[PDB]
Design a protein around this ligand. Structure first.
Ligand code: GSP
Ligand code: ATP
Ligand code: FOK
Ligand code: CA
Ligand code: CA
Ligand code: CL
Ligand code: MG
Lengths: 190, 331, 186
């Protein structure tokens, strides 16, 4: 406070981190123009923003074509898993309508892990609420090691689900090295 | 009523020992694993001495060339992974340690990297070799195992709480230190006082004391440590006197400013202490204090203690001087 | 929210940081790690208030990736970004002295048309989009430590302003193909 700067960060357990990216982003960039893209991007992420508020997810940041929220925040929730699952569902549905409007193969690639996070802000200028931990770092890799239009969940995300959704073998080890080298059992949603 | 102390200092400085001493003093199957460690210390102590024999300038020759074969036995087992420690090993070890030419090598040890406990274990080989051997407390103190990472050890003294954080002294280990900088009661900074005639493991060139000083100056003038006082521990005080009284190697030859130095007025020498030792040990302390005077501005101070880490009788004493300081240095 | 024409974008990330990140009981489960990161970013923010960096507008920070832009307010704005990117090095070095670490910053700098504005009606936050940016980022990630990577266009512009460039070679930019890239000389 007098020697280290004041830190605006706090620990938060039992939370579920959704990550979502766009398959065929450059192929879409190829069709439309610089502006025409941003319109489609803003329209989708404004659309996305609403769904998060319903599905009790607090949206973190938008990183170009990367959208990521997290349920279980700002305040704890026993639904924290089910929300993200219901979120990705609505998201794959939300891309559908906008994809049919263009007529080109674009899709969302979802990934979700659970566990513990730290959350808050870094620096002084230009604050933007963000999360950090290996569990976030894992969640990110889940999206990276995801499959088109399917929801990629972790071993931890099934133990918070109470088995309501029907799952199938994920095989994330083959789509990502961080997943492989950490022996993460992954699953997919039916 | 809880204080978090952090142990800083270069490699081999003595951090690990200080914690061991707290386990002795203020704490409460398991030791059989350490027996193995002590044997390792022994193995590498003698194997290092012999290996040094030829690479030294000038080279040193065995007093009894009968021992040449044993010398060959040692080098043949130097790198062997899980050593069986057979009775042959101890026999050949003692033989060498008996050899005058080998001792001459040890007496020139400052010219190569050799652990502090060499002589100590080597002198008691017939003690260590027994299969029902149980290490003494002092044996546990002297047993050297490099620390990599941060290891907390909690304890209670007169219903007051302490959190001690042991870190790695080496350079690739100094990066982790940061994690214990925030919310610290004070620094305990440890220094191989005796290592004035030695270089470091990290690069075989940088002088160990000169290193400790520059590491100290880093801590004393650190941006996250501006308000933290530093309880200075000038360790290995036994080994210092041993070197000073020996007078084989000199201080003015590694630190030329010592030639100028004379002993301070406020000198509180121990009973029957040689002035030479007094002059030496306080010079060292003063080198450190020159860093604790240039900056600080009464926002943080420095508290020197002459300490011998492997002396439980001296550690209680000095840590009691420290308890006095902390009781008002959290107010 | 509007479009632009000549905006200079800089990405500077810290590759060495992800390793340094730990989660143990000793570091309060990755809090102390994030605490040093704060100190670093906060040092980088202490540069925007400077007068010669008044033109520098910080956009956001991706993990340890610091993202900024000049010209949102002729080509002197491209040079500024470099003097800024140099500066972060002085700030990242400073930390190393005190933090007993060896962090190296890795800088990618591009320029061209961008679109700047707000996205989402929830929490309105400033962001820039388009190819120019995508390349800026792609040049950071394919960069070398202690070095600033620039495109062929920027190479030239900096050469007028008295900066020398050494050709990196060729890069496969996802969607823009193979292209020539450069390093500014220390
Ligand atoms: N003679 C003598 N030996 C000592 C003294 N203090 C420590 N030693 C010996 O020196 C050796 C090295 O000390 P150690 O505690 O391991 O340093 P360290 O701070 O832990 O080194 P590192 O873990 O940062 S790499 C130990 O084996 C110990 O017995 C002392 O005061 N006098
Ligand atoms: N405004 C921005 N903020 C943060 N990151 C950005 C921004 N703009 C672009 N990027 C970066 O651009 C990079 C390029 O994205 P990427 O190539 O993965 O998309 P893609 O063409 O859909 O490929 P893929 O289908 O394999 O994911 C991303 O990793 C992203 O981090
Ligand atoms: C900064 C902390 C640390 C170590 C932990 C962390 O959670 C991350 O911030 C996430 C995962 C995390 O903050 C979520 C977004 C994103 C962008 C995916 C991050 C980056 O991959 C970071 O690494 C980079 C590249 O900065 C990373 C991994 O770094
Ligand atoms: Ca992407
Ligand atoms: Ca993408
Ligand atoms: Cl030392
Ligand atoms: Mg140690």
């Amino acid at each position: 406070d007098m020697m280290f700067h004041k830190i605006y960060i706090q620990k938060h357990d039992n939370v579920s981190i959704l990550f979502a990216d766009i398959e065929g982003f450059t192929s879409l960039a190829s069709q439309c123009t610089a502006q025409e893209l941003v319109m489609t991007l803003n329209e989708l992420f404004a659309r996305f923003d609403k769904l998060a508020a319903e599905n009790h997810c607090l949206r973190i940041k938008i990183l170009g074509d990367c959208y990521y929220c997290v349920s279980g925040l700002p305040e704890a929730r026993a639904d924290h898993a089910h929300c993200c699952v219901e979120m990705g569902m609505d998201m794959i549905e939300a891309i559908s309508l906008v994809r049919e409007m263009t007529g080109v193969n674009v899709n969302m690639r979802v990934g979700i892990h659970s566990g513990r996070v730290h959350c808050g802000v870094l620096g002084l200028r230009k604050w933007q609420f963000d999360v950090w931990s290996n569990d976030v770092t894992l969640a990110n890799h889940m999206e990276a090691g995801g499959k088109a239009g399917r929801i990629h969940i972790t071993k931890a995300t099934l133990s918070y689900l109470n088995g309501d959704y029907e799952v199938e073998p994920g095989c994330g080890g083959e789509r990502n090295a961080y997943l492989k080298e950490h022996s993460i059992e992954t699953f997919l949603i039916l | 009523a809880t204080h978090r102390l952090l142990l800083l200092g270069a490699g081999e400085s003595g951090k690990s020992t200080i914690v061991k001493q707290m386990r002795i003093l203020h704490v409460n199957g398991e030791k059989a694993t350490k027996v193995q460690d002590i044997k390792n210390n022994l193995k590498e102590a003698i194997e290092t001495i012999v290996a040094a024999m030829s690479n030294l300038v000038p080279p040193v020759e065995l007093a009894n060339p009968e021992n040449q074969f044993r010398v060959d036995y040692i080098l043949s087992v130097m790198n062997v992974p899980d050593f069986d420690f057979p009775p042959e090993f101890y026999e050949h070890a003692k033989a060498l340690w008996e050899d005058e030419g080998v001792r001459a090598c040890y007496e020139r040890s400052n010219e190569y990297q050799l652990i502090d406990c060499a002589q100590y274990f080597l002198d008691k080989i017939d003690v260590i070799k027994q299969d029902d051997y149980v290490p003494s407390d002092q044996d546990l103190l002297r047993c050297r195992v490099l620390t990599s990472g941060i290891f907390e050890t909690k304890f209670q003294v007169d219903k007051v709480n302490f959190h001690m954080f042991d870190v790695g002294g080496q350079r690739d280990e100094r990066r982790k230190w940061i994690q214990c900088f925030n919310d610290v009661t004070a620094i305990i900074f440890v220094v191989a006082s005796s290592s004035y005639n030695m270089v470091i493991r990290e690069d075989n060139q940088t002088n160990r004391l000169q290193e400790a000083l520059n590491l100290f100056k880093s801590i004393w003038n650190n941006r996250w440590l501006r308000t933290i006082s530093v309880i200075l521990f000038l360790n290995k005080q036994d080994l210092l006197a041993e070197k000073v009284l020996a007078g084989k190697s000199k201080i003015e030859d590694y630190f030329p400013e010592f030639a100028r130095y004379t002993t301070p007025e406020d000198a509180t020498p121990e009973p029957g202490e040689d002035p030479r030792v007094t002059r030496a040990k306080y010079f060292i302390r003063d080198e450190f204090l020159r860093i604790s005077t240039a900056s600080g501005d009464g926002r943080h101070y420095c508290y020197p203690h002459f300490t011998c880490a492997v002396d439980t009788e001296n550690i209680r004493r000095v840590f009691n001087d420290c308890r006095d300081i902390i009781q008002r240095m959290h107010l | 929210h509007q479009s632009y024409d000549c905006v200079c974008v800089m990405f500077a990330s810290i590759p060495d940081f992800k390793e340094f990140y730990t989660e143990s009981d000793v570091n309060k489960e990755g809090l102390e790690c994030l605490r040093l990161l704060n100190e670093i970013i906060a040092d980088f923010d202490d540069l925007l208030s400077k007068p010669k960096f008044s033109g520098v507008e910080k956009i956001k920070t991706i993990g340890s990736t610091y993202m900024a832009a000049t010209g949102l307010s002729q080509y002197m704005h491209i040079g500024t970004m470099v003097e800024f990117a140099y500066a972060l090095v002085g700030k990242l070095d400073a930390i190393n002295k005190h933090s007993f670490n060896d962090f190296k910053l890795r800088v990618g700098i591009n320029h061209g048309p961008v679109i700047a504005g707000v996205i989402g009606a929830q929490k309105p936050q400033y962001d820039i989009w388009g190819n120019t940016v995508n390349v800026a980022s792609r040049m950071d990630s394919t960069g070398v430590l202690d070095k600033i990577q620039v495109t062929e266009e920027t190479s030239l512009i900096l050469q007028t302003l008295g900066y020398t460039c050494t050709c990196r070679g060729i890069i496969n930019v996802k969607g823009k193909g193979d292209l020539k890239t450069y390093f500014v000389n220390t």
